[PDB]
């Protein structure tokens, strides 16, 4: 089992996809592991907080070369593991394998592209059909995606999250009481958790994505003071500089897919938290491909 998991991990390091029975025994064990985790999963420092990978597997290998190997480096990925990367299946399989093998050395959160409709539209379903012929692996991964924790909390200070805040969410107790074992709705606090963005604005607003909201500095300050938080880490938006502070350094947006869409030319970054929350950003170029 553990030796089999290590063999699967060292196989997936060079982009060899797993088999159907391997996806069976891996996803149905990740279901058991992710069931015990709460919606606000308590991550202990040190951890390296990462942004959207978006299926760019060789960029994920570059990310591992920059920040370190798991389990040596604790990682915290804020969703969007799939959807218009050329190797989304291998990426999500490798990170799920790391979650299963090292349950305390990596925390994987749900993003907005881990819904059934979003993977159906944006090429993860097509990638599963191309790489496996059938369609059971796609719905296996979405059933796993239903089990993923919504948010993460580092030391009770840094509130890691893929999307942004919600008008209907004022406390972390609301997030802990959310029924996360469901498909991502078109509206509601869970959809706002996975889909919202920050903005330079004076309050709430409707997001241009058609799902979630958008919020300004005062909302972020109110949420931080009402919950005893110093920072809200975020990953849902694209940053050309890799990371970007917002709202007087209350919300930081971290993108971890360098050269997003293989066309954007962005230069992604990851956020390393020290033993005493002494943060560090490691910007990295897209990896060479031969």
């Amino acid at each position: 089992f553990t030796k089999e998991l290590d063999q699967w991990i060292e196989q997936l390091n060079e982009c060899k996809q797993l088999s159907e029975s391997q996806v069976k025994s891996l996803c149905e064990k990740a279901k058991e592991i992710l069931t015990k985790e709460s919606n606000v999963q308590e991550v202990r420092c040190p951890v390296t907080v990462c942004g959207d990978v978006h299926g760019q597997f060789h960029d994920l290998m570059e990310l591992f070369r920059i920040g370190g190997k798991s389990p040596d480096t604790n990682y915290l990925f804020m969703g969007d593991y799939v959807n218009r990367g050329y190797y989304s299946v291998e990426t999500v399989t490798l990170l799920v394998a790391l979650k299963v093998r090292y349950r305390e050395r990596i925390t994987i959160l749900r993003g907005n592209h881990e819904s059934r409709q979003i993977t159906q539209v944006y090429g993860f379903y097509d990638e599963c059909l191309r790489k496996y012929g059938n369609a059971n692996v796609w719905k296996y991964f979405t059933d796993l995606f239903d089990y993923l924790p919504l948010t993460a909390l580092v030391d009770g200070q840094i509130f890691c999250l893929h999307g942004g805040l919600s008008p209907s969410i004022d406390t972390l107790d609301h997030i802990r009481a959310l029924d996360r074992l469901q498909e991502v709705p078109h509206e509601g606090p869970m959809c706002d958790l996975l889909w919202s963005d920050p903005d330079d604005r004076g309050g709430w607003g409707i997001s241009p994505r058609g799902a979630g909201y958008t919020f300004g500095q005062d909302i972020s300050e109110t949420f931080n003071h009402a919950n005893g938080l110093t920072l809200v880490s975020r990953a849902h938006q694209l940053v050309m500089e890799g990371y970007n502070w917002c709202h007087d350094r209350n919300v930081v947006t971290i993108f971890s897919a360098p050269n997003y869409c293989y066309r954007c030319g962005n230069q992604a970054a990851i956020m390393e938290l020290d033993d005493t929350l002494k943060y560090s950003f490691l910007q990295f170029d897209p990896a060479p491909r031969r």
């Binding site: 370190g68 020290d274 033993d275 002494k278």
Partner: peptide
Amino acid sequence: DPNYLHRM
């Protein structure tokens, strides 16, 4: 060194 990855 206080930083963890320098120890690793």
